[PDB]
Amino acid sequence: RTFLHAADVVLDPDTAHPELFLSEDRRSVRRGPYRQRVPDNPERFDSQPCVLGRESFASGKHYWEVEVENVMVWTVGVCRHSVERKGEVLLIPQNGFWTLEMFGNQYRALSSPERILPLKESLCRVGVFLDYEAGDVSFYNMRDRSHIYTCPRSAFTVPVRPFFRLGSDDSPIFICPALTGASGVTVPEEGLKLHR
Amino acid sequence: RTFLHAADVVLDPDTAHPELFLSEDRRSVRRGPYRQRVPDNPERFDSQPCVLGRESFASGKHYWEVEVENVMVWTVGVCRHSVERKGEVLLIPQNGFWTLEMFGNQYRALSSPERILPLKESLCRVGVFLDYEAGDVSFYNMRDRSHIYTCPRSAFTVPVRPFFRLGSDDSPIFICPALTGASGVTVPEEGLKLHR
């Protein structure tokens, strides 16, 4: 009904700019040392170093969490599933992108230089919040679950997807899997202790 | 279903032991210096300093996060709606309690001295995860989202509720509200910034 979903987000290799290298579990990405031999399929970002989450939301409330520790240049947010991928695209609401980025050591709303977020501190884990019907894309510091930014209310119209950009060469972006408990694992007599 | 519910947990004042002091919003609680004049009612813990979440779960996957910073004696987890409220009840699976506790500077699963969890760090934010159909009650350290413990799988049989015990009169426990983005707040055309 009106439940918040803690979404499980896996990256889509068919959308990934060729400089982006996906982990084997597809839950993390790093900008690697060249341009992989990947087809220029129409869902692939060919210029902007971007990748989408595979999952798409068409209603209700969803959030997921992104680890960005030791990444200089990154973008997180939501996009229309059908946004333009090809050429020097503007990552702004008008083209169906709702984003937070780190650029020149600052936090910037809607990939804009006229929107600095004067955060007192460094973000390690970012929460990306979507209320589909409310037109709401919001961002959180998951250190203390403090609000960072809500994008201007937009009607989404079509399904939306998790959006990512990795500018820097420096460290991976990790998408935090949704908690699963012991799902699919043996729980012995004393319980399952410190699973990894 | 298949999706993880980020539950919004508010404490039920009718369950709360008389030495428990709830916040106005009922989203935090402390053990106070005296017994409050609260109606007797069958739902009230009368001997153990416990309180339940208002909402019960009969199906699906749910989780919520609890802040226990500077709380020396605490229990979090899940219990059957119908657990014994009156008298000294052992907080064990047999009596419908699935818990993690801090006790004598030690972490113990199932309120048992034979279930000591050898953690390297002091817990501050604890995730409580429920998979009703799987019989799964799991605990997470929400600093790094790392697994602490899954109880031996149990047939819940009846609806279950968030369970809390607060033994020490030092610090409140806080139940982290579900993220809501800009719900009930005007988003300016500039978008909403560091909401507090």
Author numbering:
A (entry chain B), B (entry chain A): 321 to 516
From the manuscript:
Vγ9Vδ2 T cells—a major subtype of human circulating γδ T cells—respond to multiple cancers and infectious diseases in an MHC-independent manner; they are specifically activated by small, non-peptidic diphosphate metabolites called pAgs. The sensing of pAgs in target cells requires a surface protein, BTN3A112–17, that has both intracellular and extracellular domains. Here we show how—in both humans and alpaca—multiple pAgs function as ‘molecular glues’ to promote heteromeric association between the intracellular domains of BTN3A1 and the structurally similar butyrophilin BTN2A1. The BTN3A1–pAg complex functions as a composite interface that directly binds to BTN2A1, bridged by the pAg molecule at the centre of the interface.
After introducing two gain-of-function mutations to the B30.2 domain of BTN2A2 (a BTN2A1 paralogue with 88.7% similarity), we observed efficient binding to BTN3A1 B30.2 in the presence of HMBPP. Notably, Vγ9Vδ2 T cell activation occurred only when the JM domain, transmembrane domain and ectodomain of BTN2A2 were replaced with their BTN2A1 counterparts.
